[PDB]
Amino acid sequence: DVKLVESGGGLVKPGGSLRLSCAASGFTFRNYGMSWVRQTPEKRLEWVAAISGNSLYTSYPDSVKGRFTISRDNAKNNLYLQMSSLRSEDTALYFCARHDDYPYFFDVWGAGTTVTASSAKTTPPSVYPLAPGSAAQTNSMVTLGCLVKGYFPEPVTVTWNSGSLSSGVHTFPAVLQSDLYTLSSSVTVPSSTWPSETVTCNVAHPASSTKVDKKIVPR
């Protein structure tokens, strides 16, 4: 009900520029100070800019002074962040957050918008099936996977059997490879279930407008 919705995030070559928006509803935006706070990939929180309800006051930490400009348009209930001369250090999830000007710092935060500063190019994933073969031999449960390799930027979504297979799934955080991401997902089912009923991973990469389905077949 009291809500903040960030938009505008994306991927920029270093040196580039980008504008974020934070849409406020459920409160008199004009009475509230607002800040942007980013969360780095390593999960540190860093306050990056503040603006008073009346725009008469703004401030920034030294790390972003000259490159970020916070502003707002009260009549449109929007907060903005103009980011320029972006650096690799600016890659983070950017939250907008309220603080009354009329106590309760950041009682309300948005869901965040992601900014990635990189000359890495948007690349669709390769999706590889992970099936047993010989090895052993066999038990009551079987573990299968999908290896989702060589994509950029994050994220990728992974489901199994379009989401009907939800229990016994582990999808692992992606790691950087050579300027590209790799992740894997595992699913454990009853041995009486596979290979007799199908197991298929569904991988989506919104950034490259790709979806890949891979049925796990025995070797």
């Binding site: 930490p61 950041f106 965040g112 582990h170 692992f172 894997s184 454990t188």
Partner: protein, 214 residues
Amino acid sequence: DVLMTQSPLSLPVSLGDQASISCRCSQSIVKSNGHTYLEWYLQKPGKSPKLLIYKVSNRFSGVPDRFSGSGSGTDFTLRISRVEAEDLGVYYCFQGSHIPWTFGGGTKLESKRADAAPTVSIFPPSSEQLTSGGASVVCFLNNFYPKDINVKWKIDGSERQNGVLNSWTDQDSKDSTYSMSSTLTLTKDEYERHNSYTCEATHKTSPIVKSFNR
């Protein structure tokens, strides 16, 4: 700038028991009216941070009685008297007294359980992947506890370090376990030159070993 140092970094606790998290500032954060703007935030991995405590010791709207804040001068304490499953996640202190407002580095509140050995599964390179000229061998180490586990790879009986990437899940909400994926990436040529591929889970001695022959 006011440095906010948070300890411990990780805090296992049995649900129903007490947890204490400390935050120390590098300098005073008292403002001219004599008040201290020390806040505590709770974040879950699928969530934004949520305000729990403000002005050192006050519970925010809807925060239950089991959360309490204390502190003086430069040392501040968040206490949770009877930790619940819904309380697990990352806690951050924050000071809003002096520009630039700064955060502590976070404390991961985790739950204890009984030890559990990993279920280990190894998978060879796929036919698809070999067509691109690459070969990744994947090992899952699933549903173990505690979180500390080491993976060792061997090729034809001998340790391999190069080409290994590891990744860990967050603690499983339902069973309090951890899981780990380990991926050994080789060229197709290096893979085709060798026969035996093994993944070994220790600590845990002795290892849980899974293998295949190309």
